[PDB]
Scaffold this motif. Structure first.
Motif, short mmCIF file in Angstrom:
data_model
loop_
_atom_site.label_atom_id
_atom_site.label_comp_id
_atom_site.label_asym_id
_atom_site.label_seq_id
_atom_site.Cartn_x
_atom_site.Cartn_y
_atom_site.Cartn_z
N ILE A 1 40.64 7.18 59.07
CA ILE A 1 41.32 8.57 58.55
C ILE A 1 41.81 9.04 59.76
O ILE A 1 43.04 9.64 59.69
CB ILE A 1 40.29 9.33 57.78
CG1 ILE A 1 40.32 9.11 56.27
CG2 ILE A 1 40.52 10.69 58.08
CD1 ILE A 1 41.17 9.71 55.65
N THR B 1 35.05 9.46 42.55
CA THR B 1 35.89 8.41 42.55
C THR B 1 35.68 7.17 42.04
O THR B 1 35.99 6.42 41.47
CB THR B 1 36.29 8.22 44.00
OG1 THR B 1 37.20 9.19 44.49
CG2 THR B 1 37.49 6.95 44.09
N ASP C 1 34.98 7.05 49.76
CA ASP C 1 35.78 7.87 49.67
C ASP C 1 36.70 7.98 51.04
O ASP C 1 37.98 8.05 50.73
CB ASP C 1 34.97 9.42 49.81
CG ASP C 1 35.80 10.46 50.02
OD1 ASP C 1 37.14 10.49 50.30
OD2 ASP C 1 35.10 11.75 49.37
N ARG D 1 39.36 4.89 50.77
CA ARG D 1 40.34 4.93 49.48
C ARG D 1 41.40 5.96 49.94
O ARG D 1 42.48 5.78 49.35
CB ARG D 1 39.45 4.99 48.26
CG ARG D 1 38.87 3.76 47.61
CD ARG D 1 39.86 2.91 47.01
NE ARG D 1 40.53 1.95 48.00
CZ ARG D 1 40.52 0.72 48.09
NH1 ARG D 1 39.59 0.00 47.39
NH2 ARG D 1 41.14 0.13 48.79
N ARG D 2 41.06 7.28 50.49
CA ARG D 2 41.79 8.17 50.54
C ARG D 2 42.80 7.73 51.60
O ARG D 2 44.11 8.23 51.57
CB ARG D 2 41.11 9.44 51.15
CG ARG D 2 40.87 10.46 50.10
CD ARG D 2 40.46 11.67 50.40
NE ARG D 2 39.32 11.87 51.11
CZ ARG D 2 39.05 12.15 52.39
NH1 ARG D 2 40.07 12.38 53.20
NH2 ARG D 2 37.81 12.21 52.94
N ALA D 3 42.53 6.86 52.68
CA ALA D 3 43.57 6.50 53.65
C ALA D 3 44.43 5.49 53.10
O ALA D 3 45.52 5.29 53.28
CB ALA D 3 42.62 5.75 54.78
N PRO E 1 45.25 4.12 49.20
CA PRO E 1 45.11 4.17 47.88
C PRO E 1 45.27 3.12 47.19
O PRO E 1 46.31 2.28 47.75
CB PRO E 1 46.23 5.48 47.40
CG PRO E 1 46.18 6.16 48.83
CD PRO E 1 46.06 5.26 49.88
#
Lengths: 246, 51, 101, 298, 299, 298
Positions: free
Chosen positions: D39, D241, D290, D293-295, D297
């Motif tokens: 991230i 998520t 989390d 997956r946010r970094a 998708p």
């Protein structure tokens, strides 16, 4: 400790051919297999830690005198390192090797009526990792092809889809399958800190893991001193006295 | 584990002297009058040595 | 004194050129003679290889296989591999070496 | 007599018993550390107008260079993290990640894997049972703040027993109107708006006068040992998520609106200490899921 | 007339009047800074597999070197902070920390003790009173969001007045069904779902037609000056740790579910301005207490 | 038949149509990056006992050297940020920031204007409609946790229809007492405390017995694409500050208690995709507004 370090189907099968049934069985009473007990884990909690005993813990437990008991002891030895207490097995069976008990008809044991679903429940297959389940399926497949119950092995696999995913891809009769197998069945191996785990299975497994490095070097001389002038027990020649109770 | 005073009163984070007005202070000495009512080189000489 | 400055610096053409070559050096390593992954296998294990060039027992694979004989290929880093004492047992089954150039 | 029980405490499903050893714990801690770096590297790449920071971070995480045409999934580390999350939730999950894969992934970074060097506070209020006599209505709503609505229709005042379990540290009760509460075999004090109680003290009796309904709002705090890298903000987001991604879609399992309800419900089952350690590992895994997956998708 | 009020606004107990000077606020500021470094060093030690970063941070915090067989509790700084937190909460709590100790610990770091650099938004909704006629029932539940349930049993439409105090900056009212709300001596507009109200406008009248109950959900936001290092998430965790650790067990005190309710309740009292200043200092101290306890845990 | 609807889903108002192009999105991203560094420099200056880190950060942000006897407002960037926030909220608000000024401020940093790289989970519970037959009462209260109070005064059991829309991803229902729920033209299962449903599955029919009131608590999770710098906790703080500062006061606009309710309500109205695109930009601007106002109060 030696049976857990084998990481290939070839090495595991070779070990079972060399190892007699005596090291699969044990001579210690232990306790009742399934029981809700409170154990002390003071590294984490002041209160006693709840847990359930089973046959996968590397600790001897009482087993009945039948083919089901003998099979359960053999599988527990393969997947955990310690067997069970089956009283008065007899010289003829103890001198035979583990593989011959699983795959040969000259042992004098009938295994045609084995129920694979009941054995998995009794061995608590739910609380097994990927490596242990693979080893159990190797023993099941060997017994299935020995007695001709290959269909029942497929029915059991179909009922348990997760086990079907990780099932071994070897045919007991063929040798090309064993040579080309690529499974990783090692449980113990050289890498972990000298700490305590919460579960009985996890704690006992870690004890084997920490002792493997020391066992790698110390077993050579101490073993050779024991059987310096001793006749091998495996397939020992005898008058073939009798097989009682089987 | 130990501790020691950084030599010469220099903060490593700032990389300068602890006092943040040193440049203003030196210029103040340069334009000052000391030891005489009349003009002298005391202020200028001390400023050069301080710098 | 200049460490930690916020002075803007104009990116000149020569800096842009070298940044391009540096990026393609990392991205396309095979063009420059180095790789980040090798595989050692016994001869009796049949691994799919690149048959486009007609080589005999080509050491080149289109991509290092994820699974061989229905099971995933083991991956060992170079530091752990260097420190291993049971390399004879591990090398009998074949593995993939990574974490090195 | 009627019984009222909080919805989220009913029938906790057994949790997985795999991937809870020292090697597996180290892998989860490694995944969190590298996911956090993923991230930060994306933010650095955006700020610096360059892709060098992100290429290094993605290569370490996925053991492969990023490619424009190929999709960025995280490689084998993403698959292993996804699979252990399923195994942690239920005992019926396949648990099909090899041990050799976990050991090689735990050797990437150096972490202790100790999940007992800190603590966190969980705010779910456990109401195991509320015992009410005839001609009385009791309803419990909520899990983070529980409202107990009580109506008396009989001739006289009624005694209503509250059981808050034996695990929660403190319970604070605030009523709509002043009311009387006391422990068993104890005199009742004057009517008061607030009460601070220890659940270990015992069942508490509440006097319900005849008339308007009485609503009691409950708030509880419980301390559970967690790793030092535990972050409740990230764990709760990762929990949502995973539910949306279908990682918990297994047969014969329960469902919870938050991770706080999940861990407290498993704590209050028969021998709940057995499950708290595994639940905390799942939380740290959900923290790594989390951030990854946010970094990246998918 | 029947009256209803928020449970958490009832009888705010007095706060401490000690350790509120420049030196004491500097000591609390230093404690928060050194506690934060203690948490970071524990993380750096764990990712690095060396105890050196943690030992150095603990040495600054406790002025002593950790030794085995001796439990790491924080030393004299932890002892002073815990007892000071008690003194802030209630006026019945003793003052047992000497001034020479506060001055010594304040000098450990060079930070400003000013507690009004920044602000923070607090979510507790203050409902001071709700007055209803004879044939109506009103119930108020909640602190983060207040649900007011109103039932009309009489034949005619009822008028219910709402008082939200003068401290909150905004209050938003949402109803299960559209309803009518207007200020005193003002015409009532068409029935709507939401209203945005400034509490200083005055008491608000809501018409309650006869029939099914009407429920109003209230949300409020108020702004309180806090130091720039103030973190709301850490303060709430510290508030719960202090309550569980048993250091809020003083005679004749009120207990709250969060630091949000505590600070708002003290604000809605006589001399509420002076109480809020003391409560802000206690909030920063609770932030230091939380970080120190997580770094050095007990079972 | 009676219809019950969530309060915050009623009559969304049009949002702004200005400051959406690529250059404008760069300005919001630069403002967020510069505002974050401002608050970090505030902490660093206190620790290091020197004002150099703050002076450098403020000079970059406000294009002016900080001086004593000045209010430290924030310069042109703060004025541009404030006026841009007003523009997004309503279509009636004026757009009074020249485009050349926005581009000039966007050149202070080199960041991408992408606002759809990552995702975020939003917790508002959308209940579009609850349809009930005669002789029954239905009440809906709450946004983050919706409680539906249900009473049956009729002779027999009643069927009540729930409609959660199509935008939401998952919905979890928890009942005070076990109840029965199934989709249309599907058999009714046994009484169960909790249900997990995908809103796209269709209307859900719940069987309400005649005895005692039934309360159902609902929790929903929705995924909305957001920039990687999005921080929900900071966005919420900015939303309450802008409302208190009076940036949202204009004729004919709905008012919401949280940014959670704002973005979900805008999604469920007609032309939902474009509204959420503008709302996400407002979230990043609100995030920047919170940090700049907390560093520089005025």
């Amino acid at each position: 400790m030696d049976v857990l370090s084998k990481g290939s189907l070839k090495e595991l099968l070779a070990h079972l051919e060399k190892t007699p049934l005596e090291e699969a069985i044990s001579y210690r009473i232990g306790t009742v297999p399934y029981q809700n007990v409170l154990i002390s884990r003071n590294e984490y909690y002041n209160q006693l830690y709840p847990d359930t005993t089973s046959l996968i813990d590397g600790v001897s437990r009482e087993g009945q005198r039948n083919v089901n008991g003998l099979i359960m002891s053999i599988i527990s030895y393969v997947v955990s390192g310690s067997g069970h207490y089956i009283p008065n097995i007899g010289f003829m069976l103890l001198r035979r090797s583990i593989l011959d008990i699983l795959t040969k008809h000259d042992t004098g044991l009938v295994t045609n009526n084995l129920n694979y679903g009941i054995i998995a429940r009794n061995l608590t297959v739910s609380k097994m990792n990927c490596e242990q389940r693979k080893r159990m399926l190797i023993c099941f497949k060997l017994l299935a092809y020995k007695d001709g119950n290959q269909n029942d092995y497929e029915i059991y696999l179909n009922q348990n889809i997760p086990l079907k995913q990780i099932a071994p891809n070897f045919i007991p009769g063929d040798m090309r399958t064993v040579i080309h197998n690529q499974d990783q069945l090692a449980i113990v191996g050289i890498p972990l800190t000298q700490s305590t785990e919460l579960s009985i299975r996890d704690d006992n497994a870690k004890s084997y893991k920490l002792g493997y490095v020391d066992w790698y070097n110390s077993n050579s001389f101490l073993r050779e001193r024991s059987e310096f002038n001793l006749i091998r027990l495996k397939d020992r020649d005898t008058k073939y006295g009798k097989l009682n109770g089987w | 584990v130990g501790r020691y005073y950084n030599p010469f009163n220099i903060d490593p984070l700032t990389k300068k002297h602890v006092e943040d007005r040193l440049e203003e202070f030196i210029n103040q000495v340069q334009v000052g009058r000391f030891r005489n009512a009349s003009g002298n080189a005391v202020g200028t000489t001390l400023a050069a040595f301080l710098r | 004194k200049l460490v930690g400055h916020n002075y803007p610096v104009y990116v000149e053409p020569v800096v842009n050129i070298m940044n391009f070559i540096s990026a393609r050096f990392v991205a396309d390593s095979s063009y420059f003679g180095y790789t980040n992954e090798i595989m050692i296998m016994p001869n009796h294990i049949n691994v799919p290889v690149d048959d486009r060039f007609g080589f005999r027992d080509s050491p080149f694979c289109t991509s290092l296989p994820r699974t061989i004989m229905g099971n995933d290929v083991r991956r060992i880093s170079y530091n752990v591999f260097s420190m291993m004492e049971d390399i004879d047992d591990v090398i009998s089954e074949g593995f993939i070496l990574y974490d090195a150039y | 007599a009627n019984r009222a029980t909080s919805a989220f405490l009913d029938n906790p499903h057994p949790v997985g018993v795999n991937y809870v050893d020292e090697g597996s714990r180290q892998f989860v801690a490694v995944a969190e550390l590298l996911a956090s770096k993923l991230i930060d590297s994306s933010r650095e790449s955006d700020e610096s107008n360059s892709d060098v920071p992100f290429v290094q971070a993605y290569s370490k995480f996925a053991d492969d260079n990023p490619r424009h045409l190929r999709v960025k999934t995280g490689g084998k580390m993403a698959n292993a993290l996804t699979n252990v999350i399923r195994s942690y939730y239920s005992i019926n999950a396949p648990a099909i990640v090899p041990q050799v894969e976990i050991d090689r992934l735990a050797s990437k970074a150096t972490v202790s894997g100790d999940m007992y060097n800190s603590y966190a506070i969980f705010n779910s209020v456990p109401i195991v049972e509320v015992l009410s006599p005839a001609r009385t209505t009791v309803s419990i709503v909520g899990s983070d703040r529980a409202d107990v609505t009580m109506l008396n229709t009989g001739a006289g005042a009624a005694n209503i027993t509250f059981n808050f379990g034996q695990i929660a540290e403190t319970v604070i009760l605030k009523g709509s109107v002043p009311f009387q509460l006391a422990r068993l075999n104890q005199p009742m004090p004057a009517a008061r708006f607030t009460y601070k109680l220890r659940p270990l003290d015992g069942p508490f009796i509440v006097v319900l006068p005849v008339g308007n309904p009485l609503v009691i709002s409950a708030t509880a705090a419980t301390r559970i040992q967690v790793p030092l890298a535990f972050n409740k903000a990230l764990v709760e987001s990762g929990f949502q998520t995973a539910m949306n991604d279908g990682l918990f879609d297994i047969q014969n399992v329960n469902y919870y609106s938050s991770f706080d309800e999940f861990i407290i419900s498993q704590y209050h089952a028969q021998d709940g200490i057995n499950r708290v350690s595994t639940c905390v590992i799942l939380g740290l895994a959900l923290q790594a899921y989390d951030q990854m997956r946010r970094a990246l998708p998918v």
